[PDB]
Write a protein that binds this ligand. Structure first.
Ligand SMILES: *[C@@H]1O[C@H](CO)[C@@H](O[C@@H]2O[C@H](CO)[C@@H](O)[C@H](O)[C@H]2NC(C)=O)[C@H](O)[C@H]1NC(C)=O
Ligand SMILES: *[C@@H]1O[C@H](CO)[C@@H](O[C@@H]2O[C@H](CO)[C@@H](O)[C@H](O)[C@H]2NC(C)=O)[C@H](O)[C@H]1NC(C)=O
Ligand SMILES: *[C@@H]1O[C@H](CO)[C@@H](O[C@@H]2O[C@H](CO)[C@@H](O)[C@H](O)[C@H]2NC(C)=O)[C@H](O)[C@H]1NC(C)=O
Ligand SMILES: *[C@@H]1O[C@H](CO)[C@@H](O[C@@H]2O[C@H](CO)[C@@H](O)[C@H](O)[C@H]2NC(C)=O)[C@H](O)[C@H]1NC(C)=O
Ligand SMILES: *[C@@H]1O[C@H](CO)[C@@H](O[C@@H]2O[C@H](CO)[C@@H](O)[C@H](O)[C@H]2NC(C)=O)[C@H](O)[C@H]1NC(C)=O
Ligand SMILES: *[C@@H]1O[C@H](CO)[C@@H](O)[C@H](O)[C@H]1NC(C)=O
Ligand SMILES: *[C@@H]1O[C@H](CO)[C@@H](O)[C@H](O)[C@H]1NC(C)=O
Ligand SMILES: *[C@@H]1O[C@H](CO)[C@@H](O)[C@H](O)[C@H]1NC(C)=O
Lengths: 184, 198, 169
């Protein structure tokens, strides 16, 4: 539209320390578009006569709500338009994963969840922890973050080979443990 | 034998906690008896307060001020069910404030017979106008001399005690209550010391 | 029904005035929301004050009679409750924002008080959707403007209650 402007992408989910290139396309009547971050100027490059590119290098994590990118035009229609840039932390590997038995019926395994990488809006909500054994082929999403109560089926099987997996919308970490039933 | 009608239904709201209500059961029934405390507004109902042990139970919801609330307790056993009388009160008139802290006593170089007091009060973030009661005494005497309560009726955070002996130490303590005279008197604050000027 | 809101009228009026003075404060809900959404830039605050939702003005409230004023207050509080419920169902984080629940309880209390006051005057009150969001900047701006308008309306209704207490005809 000659009296409007667009910006892409909208509500991008990135990882802390990556790059991004934001495009901005304004109409014909709009002139001298100037975009800014929270509080700083941004040196934009004009790809074409009506387009402008914004380059951000090594974005830093500010808050779990995202970094607002407000862009206001000096000439033409006086208004404010922009998008929110969601930056998330790096997912860590579970540390000191160990399990135990009490009465040959349940296995209370515990681990360290690490750093929380859950956002506030509807972008990233779940951080699942899946524990799947090899000799039995059983795994379900645990309801807790650093604990789980495993139920062993009958058969007097004395062997275990687990593989804990933590996955979010960005990456997926995995750690394997190996132990014995009578030795723990 | 079946229970009797409960009485002595009173409720107190501590600053920073939920509403706590107490009553007397009466006679021993020699049977398993449950006591449930009801609570509701004029247009809304609240969860029940089931006494886990004894007669008092602490509610689970947050207290809302400036709204009349009606509560009553029902006694039920294996032989009958009887409920006490209901009371209609305001949660802001049953608040028990916390004692003021950071009590400091400062002297004056010009007037050696005065001692200016200084303290801070919570007041739920500036919501309640609290009047205070100030008691002072020397270091060797055991009795406490109380200032006239009419002089400390206005909401304030400082007071100047006069008619004191020059070059003598004193001990002070304070407690606050609502301006309208309702509610409950707070506990005594920490004793602060102060020496008059020469 | 008859299990609350005793026949005392001066106490009810004082409670209403105190609730209005407590609610009509920018530090209650608007300032925490602004400090949480990273909207501290002066341009962002100008955009906040620019977009304003249409609320009844002060002269309109002062020109109306008493039952009409009570009915309009009831309807406006109902709309504010609906909008707050929508914002809660869109934000999807309850523990990081208890001011929303506090304001909701305060609005419910004000609604109960005004209903009781209307019942005391022998007047009958008038008895009467997408979770996902495409954009977030526009939603933030809209919520900011709505909170600003709500605080202004609470201040206006508090001033009207004060004028009513001064009159007492
Ligand atoms: C983000 O942009 C920077 C700057 O353009 C780039 O950093 C390059 O990283 C590679 C690999 O380490 C180096 O060989 C180059 O010398 C760096 N500079 C340039 C200009 O290419 C890269 O595109 C991105 N960096 C990261 C860490 O993601
Ligand atoms: C992480 O766990 C959640 C919660 O159990 C699951 O999310 C499901 O995702 C599927 C596919 O998108 C939906 O059909 C379901 O409605 C979601 N909820 C449930 C309860 O199943 C899923 O196991 C994992 N999701 C992600 C994104 O990793
Ligand atoms: C025990 O569990 C580990 C990890 O889950 C698995 O080891 C895999 O073994 C296969 C067979 O050689 C390899 O191709 C894979 O690379 C191994 N790693 C993974 C992550 O799959 C396997 O389930 C079990 N290993 C043994 C030796 O029994
Ligand atoms: C784990 O426990 C099982 C049984 O308690 C044992 O596994 C034995 O491993 C040896 C070495 O290969 C085999 O020769 C035996 O047949 C296995 N079974 C038994 C009953 O001895 C052993 O105690 C543990 N496993 C290992 C590899 O040490
Ligand atoms: C009714 O019973 C209550 C029992 O809760 C008593 O009232 C106060 O109870 C507290 C704690 O039990 C005591 O510390 C107070 O001394 C009691 N009296 C007052 C005036 O607070 C008392 O037995 C009865 N109250 C009345 C007013 O008769
Ligand atoms: C063992 O787990 C604990 C967590 O309670 C912590 O010390 C660490 O993650 C593990 N120990 C070492 C030496 O890594
Ligand atoms: C009283 O409460 C207990 C739980 O403490 C419950 O088991 C019982 O059914 C209730 N009623 C009676 C009459 O005991
Ligand atoms: C009260 O004194 C303590 C230390 O004595 C310190 O927190 C501060 O000086 C005062 N606190 C407040 C809230 O005034």
């Amino acid at each position: 539209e000659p009296d409007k402007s667009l910006i892409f992408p909208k509500d991008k989910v990135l990882e802390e320390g990556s790059n991004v290139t934001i495009c901005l396309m304004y109409g014909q009547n709009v002139y001298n578009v100037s975009c800014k971050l929270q509080d700083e100027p941004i040196h934009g490059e004009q790809l074409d006569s009506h387009v402008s590119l914004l380059k951000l290098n090594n974005v830093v994590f500010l808050s779990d709500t995202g970094t607002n990118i407000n862009c206001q035009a000096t000439k033409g229609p006086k208004r404010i338009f922009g998008t929110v840039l969601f930056v998330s932390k790096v997912l860590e590997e579970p540390k000191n994963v160990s399990c135990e038995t009490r009465d040959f019926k349940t296995l209370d395994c515990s681990w360290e969840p690490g750093v929380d990488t859950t956002l506030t809006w509807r972008k990233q909500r779940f951080q699942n922890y899946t524990l799947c054994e090899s000799f039995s082929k059983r795994c379900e999403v645990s309801n807790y973050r650093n604990s789980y109560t495993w139920q062993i089926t009958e058969g007097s099987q004395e062997m275990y080979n687990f593989t804990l997996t933590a996955e979010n919308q960005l990456r997926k970490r995995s750690v394997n443990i190996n132990f014995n039933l009578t030795h723990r | 034998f079946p229970p009797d009608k409960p009485t002595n239904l009173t409720c107190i709201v501590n600053e920073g906690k939920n509403m706590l209500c107490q009553w007397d059961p009466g006679r021993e029934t020699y049977l398993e008896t449950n006591y449930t405390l009801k609570s509701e507004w004029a247009t809304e109902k609240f969860p029940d307060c089931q006494s886990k042990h004894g007669t008092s139970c602490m509610v689970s919801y947050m207290p809302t001020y400036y709204v009349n609330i009606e509560v009553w307790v029902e006694a039920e056993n294996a032989l009958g069910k009887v409920s006490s009388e209901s009371i209609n009160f305001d949660p802001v008139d049953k608040v028990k404030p916390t004692p003021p802290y950071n009590l400091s006593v400062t002297n004056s170089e010009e007037l050696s017979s005065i001692l200016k007091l200084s303290w801070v009060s919570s007041g739920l973030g500036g919501l309640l106008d609290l009047k205070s009661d100030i008691q002072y005494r020397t270091k060797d005497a055991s009795t406490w001399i109380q200032v006239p309560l009419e002089d400390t009726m206005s909401p304030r955070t400082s007071f100047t005690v006069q008619d004191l002996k020059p070059f003598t130490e004193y001990v002070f303590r304070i407690r606050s209550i609502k301006d309208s005279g309702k509610g409950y008197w707070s506990d005594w604050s920490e004793e602060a010391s102060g020496t008059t000027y020469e | 029904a008859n299990r609350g809101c005793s026949n005392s009228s001066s106490q009810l009026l004082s409670q209403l005035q105190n609730q209005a003075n407590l609610t009509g404060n920018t530090e209650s809900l608007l300032e925490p929301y602004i400090r949480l959404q990273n909207l501290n830039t002066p341009d962002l605050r100008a955009a906040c004050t620019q977009h304003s939702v249409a609320f009844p003005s002060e002269d309109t409230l002062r020109q109306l009679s008493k039952p009409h004023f009570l009915s309009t207050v009831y309807t406006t509080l109902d709309r504010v409750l609906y909008q707050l419920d929508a914002l809660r169902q869109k934000f999807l984080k309850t523990p990081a924002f208890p001011k929303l629940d506090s304001a909701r309880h305060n609005i419910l209390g004000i609604r109960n008080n005004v209903f009781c006051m209307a019942r005391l005057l022998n007047h009958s009150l008038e008895i009467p959707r997408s979770t996902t969001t495409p954009d977030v900047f526009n939603t933030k701006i809209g919520s900011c403007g709505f909170l600003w308008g709500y605080h202004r309306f609470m201040g206006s209704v508090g001033r009207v209650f004060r004028e009513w207490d001064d009159g007492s005809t």
